[PDB]
Amino acid sequence: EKAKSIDQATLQLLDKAKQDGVETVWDRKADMKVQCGFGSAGVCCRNCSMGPCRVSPVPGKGVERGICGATADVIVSRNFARMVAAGTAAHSDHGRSIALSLYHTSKDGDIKVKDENKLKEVAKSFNVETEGRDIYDIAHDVAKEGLSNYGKQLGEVTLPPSLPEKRKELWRKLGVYPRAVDREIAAVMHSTHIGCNADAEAMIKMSMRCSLTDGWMGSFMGTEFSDIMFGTPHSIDTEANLGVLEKNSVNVVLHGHEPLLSEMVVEAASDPELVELAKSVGADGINLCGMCCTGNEVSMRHGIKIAGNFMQQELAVVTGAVDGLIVDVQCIMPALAKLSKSYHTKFITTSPKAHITDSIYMEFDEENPLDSAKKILKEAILNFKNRDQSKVMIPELKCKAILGYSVEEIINKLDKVVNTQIGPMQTVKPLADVLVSGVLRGAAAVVGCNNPKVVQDSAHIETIKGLIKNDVIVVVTGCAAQAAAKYGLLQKEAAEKYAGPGLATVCKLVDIPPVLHMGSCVDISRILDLVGRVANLLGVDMSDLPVAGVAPEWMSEKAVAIGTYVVTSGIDTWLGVAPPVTGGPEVVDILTNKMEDWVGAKFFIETDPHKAVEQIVNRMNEKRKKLGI
Amino acid sequence: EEKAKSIDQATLQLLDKAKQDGVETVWDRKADMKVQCGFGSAGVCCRNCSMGPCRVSPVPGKGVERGICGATADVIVSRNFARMVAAGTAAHSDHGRSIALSLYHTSKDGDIKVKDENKLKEVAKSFNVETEGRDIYDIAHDVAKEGLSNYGKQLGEVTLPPSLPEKRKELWRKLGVYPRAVDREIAAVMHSTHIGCNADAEAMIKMSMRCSLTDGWMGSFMGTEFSDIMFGTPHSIDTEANLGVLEKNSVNVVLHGHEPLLSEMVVEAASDPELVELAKSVGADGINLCGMCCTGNEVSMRHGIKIAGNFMQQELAVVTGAVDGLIVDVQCIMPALAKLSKSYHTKFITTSPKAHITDSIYMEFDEENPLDSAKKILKEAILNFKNRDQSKVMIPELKCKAILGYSVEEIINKLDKVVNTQIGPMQTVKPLADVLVSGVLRGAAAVVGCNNPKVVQDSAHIETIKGLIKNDVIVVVTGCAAQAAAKYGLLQKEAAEKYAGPGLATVCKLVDIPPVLHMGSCVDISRILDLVGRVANLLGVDMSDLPVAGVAPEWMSEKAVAIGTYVVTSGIDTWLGVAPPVTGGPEVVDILTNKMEDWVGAKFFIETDPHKAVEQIVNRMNEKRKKLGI
Numbered sequence A: 001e002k003a004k005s006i007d008q009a010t011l012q013l014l015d016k017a018k019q020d021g022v023e024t025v026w027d028r029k030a031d032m033k034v035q036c037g038f039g040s041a042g043v044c045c046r047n048c049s050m051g052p053c054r055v056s057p058v059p060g061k062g063v064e065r066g067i068c069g070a071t072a073d074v075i076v077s078r079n080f081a082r083m084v085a086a087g088t089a090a091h092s093d094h095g096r097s098i099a100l101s102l103y104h105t106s107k108d109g110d111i112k113v114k115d116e117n118k119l120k121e122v123a124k125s126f127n128v129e130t131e132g133r134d135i136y137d138i139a140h141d142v143a144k145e146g147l148s149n150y151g152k153q154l155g156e157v158t159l160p161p162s163l164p165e166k167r168k169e170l171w172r173k174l175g176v177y178p179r180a181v182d183r184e185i186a187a188v189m190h191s192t193h194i195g196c197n198a199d200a201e202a203m204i205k206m207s208m209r210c211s212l213t214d215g216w217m218g219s220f221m222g223t224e225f226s227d228i229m230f231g232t233p234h235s236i237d238t239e240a241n242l243g244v245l246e247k248n249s250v251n252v253v254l255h256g257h258e259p260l261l262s263e264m265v266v267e268a269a270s271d272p273e274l275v276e277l278a279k280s281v282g283a284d285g286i287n288l289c290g291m292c293c294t295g296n297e298v299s300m301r302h303g304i305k306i307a308g309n310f311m312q313q314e315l316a317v318v319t320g321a322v323d324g325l326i327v328d329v330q331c332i333m334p335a336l337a338k339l340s341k342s343y344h345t346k347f348i349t350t351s352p353k354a355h356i357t358d359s360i361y362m363e364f365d366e367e368n369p370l371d372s373a374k375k376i377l378k379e380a381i382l383n384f385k386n387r388d389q390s391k392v393m394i395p396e397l398k399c400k401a402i403l404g405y406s407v408e409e410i411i412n413k414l415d416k417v418v419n420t421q422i423g424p425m426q427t428v429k430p431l432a433d434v435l436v437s438g439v440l441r442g443a444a445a446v447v448g449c450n451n452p453k454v455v456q457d458s459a460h461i462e463t464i465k466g467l468i469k470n471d472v473i474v475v476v477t478g479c480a481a482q483a484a485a486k487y488g489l490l491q492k493e494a495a496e497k498y499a500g501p502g503l504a505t506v507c508k509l510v511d512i513p514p515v516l517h518m519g520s521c522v523d524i525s526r527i528l529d530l531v532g533r534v535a536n537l538l539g540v541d542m543s544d545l546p547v548a549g550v551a552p553e554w555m556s557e558k559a560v561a562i563g564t565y566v567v568t569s570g571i572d573t574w575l576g577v578a579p580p581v582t583g584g585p586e587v588v589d590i591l592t593n594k595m596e597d598w599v600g601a602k603f604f605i606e607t608d609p610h611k612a613v614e615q616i617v618n619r620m621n622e623k624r625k626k627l628g629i
Numbered sequence B: 001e002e003k004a005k006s007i008d009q010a011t012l013q014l015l016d017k018a019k020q021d022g023v024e025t026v027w028d029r030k031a032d033m034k035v036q037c038g039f040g041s042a043g044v045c046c047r048n049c050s051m052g053p054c055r056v057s058p059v060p061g062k063g064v065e066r067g068i069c070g071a072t073a074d075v076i077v078s079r080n081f082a083r084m085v086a087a088g089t090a091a092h093s094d095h096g097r098s099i100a101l102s103l104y105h106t107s108k109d110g111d112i113k114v115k116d117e118n119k120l121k122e123v124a125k126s127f128n129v130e131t132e133g134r135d136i137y138d139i140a141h142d143v144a145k146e147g148l149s150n151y152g153k154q155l156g157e158v159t160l161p162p163s164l165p166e167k168r169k170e171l172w173r174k175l176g177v178y179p180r181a182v183d184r185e186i187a188a189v190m191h192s193t194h195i196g197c198n199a200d201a202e203a204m205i206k207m208s209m210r211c212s213l214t215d216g217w218m219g220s221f222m223g224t225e226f227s228d229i230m231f232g233t234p235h236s237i238d239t240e241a242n243l244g245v246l247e248k249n250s251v252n253v254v255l256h257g258h259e260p261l262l263s264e265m266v267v268e269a270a271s272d273p274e275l276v277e278l279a280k281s282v283g284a285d286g287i288n289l290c291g292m293c294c295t296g297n298e299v300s301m302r303h304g305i306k307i308a309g310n311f312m313q314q315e316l317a318v319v320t321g322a323v324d325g326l327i328v329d330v331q332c333i334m335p336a337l338a339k340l341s342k343s344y345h346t347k348f349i350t351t352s353p354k355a356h357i358t359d360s361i362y363m364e365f366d367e368e369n370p371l372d373s374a375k376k377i378l379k380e381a382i383l384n385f386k387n388r389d390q391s392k393v394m395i396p397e398l399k400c401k402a403i404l405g406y407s408v409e410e411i412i413n414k415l416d417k418v419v420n421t422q423i424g425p426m427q428t429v430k431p432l433a434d435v436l437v438s439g440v441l442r443g444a445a446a447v448v449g450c451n452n453p454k455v456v457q458d459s460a461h462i463e464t465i466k467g468l469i470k471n472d473v474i475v476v477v478t479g480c481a482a483q484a485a486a487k488y489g490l491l492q493k494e495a496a497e498k499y500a501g502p503g504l505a506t507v508c509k510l511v512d513i514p515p516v517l518h519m520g521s522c523v524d525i526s527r528i529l530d531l532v533g534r535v536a537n538l539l540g541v542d543m544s545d546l547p548v549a550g551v552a553p554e555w556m557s558e559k560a561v562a563i564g565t566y567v568v569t570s571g572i573d574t575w576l577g578v579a580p581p582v583t584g585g586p587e588v589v590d591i592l593t594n595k596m597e598d599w600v601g602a603k604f605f606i607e608t609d610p611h612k613a614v615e616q617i618v619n620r621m622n623e624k625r626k627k628l629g630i
């Protein structure tokens, strides 16, 4: 009865999937039928073998406490904590690999330093000397100091400069100032053990402390170091959606997250031997396509075409045109191994962090990265000989998209509206001014996943379209950004098409689209860098600005960690999918009310995007009045 | 027409008082839960993202076979198993992390001092720390820093104990499970269990084994060694156990939890003259300290403090109406205590910011002024004796004598009695190695683990231990299992004639030891590894070659899972008396109970009948003896 998507190409292939007789993520959601209301409310605990225990989400009725004595609030808050601990760890290991790659950069090696100016500037944040030193001794000293942020047991951690000092001392008084990344993950996992913490407030506060090691450390260093090694993103053109697949080219799709592999596949797709090889098997060339975050990472830096977002990964295989599906870690549906048994596609896993049964394991040798990517790519190009062009169905649907909007590039773009003799250059002042003046009502980040509980991409598009109509500039990352890209919002033409008067004027003056694709989900750290720069420039804290974050169709534990650190940093967050918290009323009051008194923001749970847009606008105008703007 | 709740007499008496007083127990809450969910009982339910919750069929080929993301039953089972190990590892991790921090803050005239210099000097040589002619506290700080790097170093290798055989290290390396930093492996396991990551049962379990190794050989190990350095290495010491140790006319302060620093500082505060006179002024005879669970073991091994009871007895202690102060830190403090303590004059005090409990009294243990903080907290217990009502008090006159303190150094010390002055070398484990190879001792078995309402409490412990020592298998015990043995009376030299077999009784008479050796808390299980490795190293073999076994007859916590996983990966067959949630994943069962043997030389055994378990252990040991030629 309900529509499965709002994207036509997504729907066309869904029909082919039914004809071919293959399962999709929608079909498995249906097979699940009415999902257990206990786990949907968070009032089930399995933290020890006395259980499984389930208490009633309706207070006063049914079973009240678990066998150990845990209340509903205790069970909910611990389950919520372990979600943050998981998402934190996901981004943690991500940035740890990126820092390790930076430690192994050499002058003549496969991994180099590409943005010397950024490294010199990042080195100043770690108190690493740069005057007259070799650029790789600097990079190694930066990597070492960044790695210390993951497991140091003595001393304090290094935090970015755009984090307002008001917020640091706020965290200190609240007792949520971050420690080492792995050290907090262990701390949350410790207190959630049976017979440890049994207080909702203290439990949530540990979760907020954990999430800070993600946004301002794990994800932040991951992004900063990814820019140093691969290049800081700048505005770039690309095409999005499943129509980027070419029938007469070798289609290699990069799925996953960790960017070192996809960065090396891009460089491997230009080796004359591998270029000549694709021609020898009968194709026109090598057509690199990205999906999800590793697709975002290479599109921001190299404009590689974005094949699609989370709930489309199954449908790319259904086209019958994917010769290689090269995946690393995070958000690779294990169903792909069974699905690709019905097609010539070679589904190749590469990271020992994410083995998948019945896939083809080709370990990405991080000690010979380029040679290793070539070996994996050659296997994909050879697989082109096994394509059956009669069963191929590539929908004729693709949209142009502009992305590459890093903080540096937004600042660079804003310099255009600065009078040579008046203001300062290379600052975020132009954006602060249009916010203070009121031409822009606010700025909203729209991030998040896809989720079968929501018509895929429908909540993203309605939220984004509604915010830009009310003169709220919108920045996007991850699968939401790729949902904007497919729809056609990442175009300068989208301003007069969909934006209100103020946003349309700023868009024309700055020469930008109304929706800024700021990269992958570790790249959300760019959003914090941006908002923090505006707060510092206006002498205020981040809870005082008219900013907001939205997760219209989230799913991953990464999103819970992301949403939790966005709030603790001081930014109101709207969720479009109810988290499993309804069972514990104290947990609800903490996340949706008391949070305000702690950090200056709170969570909002709204499944109607049009309602959420109202709330965001009203909350912004409320905060605007408090600030006098 | 129901099963008994316990085999302990004092436990049954107070349970009748709890019913009479109108309060609820952990047994009562178990009955309220009724039929627990078969899905979560089989481990075929996932909640690792909001696409779910999903539940797949535990019977393969029937029902819903895959979750929304495509995860099979084996994937879901294997990931849920991994997160148990990660949590159990994290608990012992932070336990030893905090202890190492105390070692870093030791000082000449401070509250925390170095007490076993000879242990500290020997540990420093294990961490490549110079000791010749250096101040003793410069050494302690260097050793602490080296131990803290084991938790979060990102480059280089980790420091491991010398009693770990190189054959086992080389085995782990080829298998791909050589441990990294403690907090790092915890994060790595949490990463791969995220949605859309690892989806292969073998790779997932192998990640669990690599993670658990950072507990037994690092987390728990460093915690135990550093606890001995600061508080003293345990030696043969007498004590009394069970709930009767409470004195009606004295101040009863009960220490519950795991972290030893608070319990240690309260012991030293219980001898402050100002507080003793206050105890007499409020109308009491003296300060009666009683411990529970690990923190009760930690102070009983070192100071002979009386042991109040094990895990499922903690509620019944408050039911006696004689607990004036209940001081708890972290790990295994049932949140029901906060509600139970409201029906009695007991003040339920939480002390650690790691484990706040609602509607309790929070007195944050100041580690910068430890003794003054312990003094301050103890005074609140003494003053609460004025609210005692002696008409309701019912302390069952039941308690048994017990011997403990059997650290590795003390066991080696006791083995010297049977060494000839001219023949063999002193201060080695050779006497224990010789009786095993000869066959006088058929094997060595470690009985550890929790309590669990699914088993008649302490019955699986006592039946397991009694059957083993009857079959000439010496039994070492830690944690609540040890306290089960202390309550029943197995921690006595008189227990040899009563229950031991011929060979074991002969070894007990010669060495002058009980047939059951209490080796401390559950981080003190590292002492058991340290012992077995010395025997493995002295016989030129690996640990999977020795006739050794581990048993957790009534386990419950995720700490036990991580414990049982590192015991197996170390090369010691482990029997489990409570079935873990793995029955829904047939590949996971094959990995844990068969394939594991071909990886690390040991495997899990799931058996709820302790008599059948003893049969399996004895037959298994004989196979490894015949394989080894002994």
Ligand code: SF4
Pocket: A045, A046, A047, A048, A049, A050, A051, A052, A053, A065, A066, A067, A068, A069, A070, A075, A193, A194, A195
């Ligand atoms: S922590 Fe408590 S409520 Fe949760 S499963 Fe364990 S015994 Fe039950």
Ligand code: SF4
Pocket: A036, A037, A038, A039, A040, A044, A045, A052, A054, B037, B039, B040, B041, B045, B046, B053, B055
């Ligand atoms: S969430 Fe709990 S009650 Fe629901 S199916 Fe899973 S184990 Fe059962």
Ligand code: SF4
Pocket: B046, B047, B048, B049, B050, B051, B052, B053, B054, B067, B068, B069, B070, B071, B076, B194, B195, B196
């Ligand atoms: S990870 Fe898979 S099995 Fe688990 S809740 Fe998500 S879709 Fe379901």
Ligand SMILES: [F-]
Pocket: A320, A321, A343, A344, A387, A388, A389, A391, A392
């Ligand atoms: F095909």
Ligand SMILES: [F-]
Pocket: A352, A353, B188
């Ligand atoms: F790893």
Ligand SMILES: [F-]
Pocket: A036, B037
């Ligand atoms: F159910």
Ligand SMILES: [F-]
Pocket: B176, B202, B203, B206
């Ligand atoms: F493996």
Ligand SMILES: [F-]
Pocket: B321, B322, B344, B345, B388, B389, B392, B393
């Ligand atoms: F009382």
Ligand SMILES: [F-]
Pocket: B233, B409, B410
């Ligand atoms: F000693």
Ligand SMILES: [F-]
Pocket: B597, B601, B602
């Ligand atoms: F074997």
Ligand code: NA
Pocket: A121, A122, A160, A224
């Ligand atoms: Na920066």
Ligand code: NA
Pocket: A340, A341, A342, A343, A344, A345, A346, A347
């Ligand atoms: Na195939």
Ligand code: NA
Pocket: A593, A596, A597
């Ligand atoms: Na309020």
Ligand code: NA
Pocket: B123, B161, B225
């Ligand atoms: Na030692």
Ligand code: NA
Pocket: B594, B595, B598
């Ligand atoms: Na076999």
Ligand code: NA
Pocket: B607, B608
């Ligand atoms: Na059975």
